[PDB]
């Protein structure tokens, strides 16, 4: 019933793990790939969809300098939430400053 699997490199290596994100596509995995690549503790972050008939993405996160790849994945999720909350705030504050000039101009 869960919707994230983690597939290690050799059962012991925790730097490379390929996250299998169930019920996603290039909507999330292209913007996660954008955030995790902004982390200088990542040698390699890329994604692929497994097969278009399927509904999951593979996400290879490959960390240099002794970190597990759960930390760039969590940081790239929170660091995308903190993009979208701010985009939501500056969008709900420019719709409001447009309705407050459509109305309060000549009416």
Report the interface residues with another protein, using CB under 8 A: 2-4, 6, 21, 24, 26-28, 30-31, 33-35, 38-40, 70, 73-74, 77-88, 90-92, 94-95, 97-99, 102
Place of tokens 């999330």: 28
Q: How many Cβ atoms are within 10 Å of 107's Cβ, its own excluded?
A: 5
Q: How far is the CB of 10 from another protein (least distance, A)?
A: 20
Which lies closer to another protein via its Cβ, residue 9 or residue 87? 87
Give the whole-angstrom CA distance, residue 48 versus residue 68.
21
19: left (phi over 0), alpha (psi -120 to 50) or beta: beta
Q: How far is the CB of 26 from another protein (least distance, A)?
A: 7
């Amino acid at each position: 019933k869960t919707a994230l699997e983690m597939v290690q490199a050799a059962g012991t290596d925790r730097h490379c793990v390929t996250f299998v994100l169930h019920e996603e596509d290039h909507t999330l995995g292209n913007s996660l790939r954008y955030m995790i690549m902004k982390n200088p503790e990542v040698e390699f972050c890329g994604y692929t969809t497994t097969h278009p008939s399927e509904s999951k993405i593979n996400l290879r996160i490959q960390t240099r300098g002794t970190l597990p790849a759960v930390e760039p994945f969590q940081r790239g999720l929170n660091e995308l939430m903190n993009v979208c909350q701010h985009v939501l705030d500056k969008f709900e504050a420019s719709i409001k400053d447009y309705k407050d000039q459509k109305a309060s101009r000549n009416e």
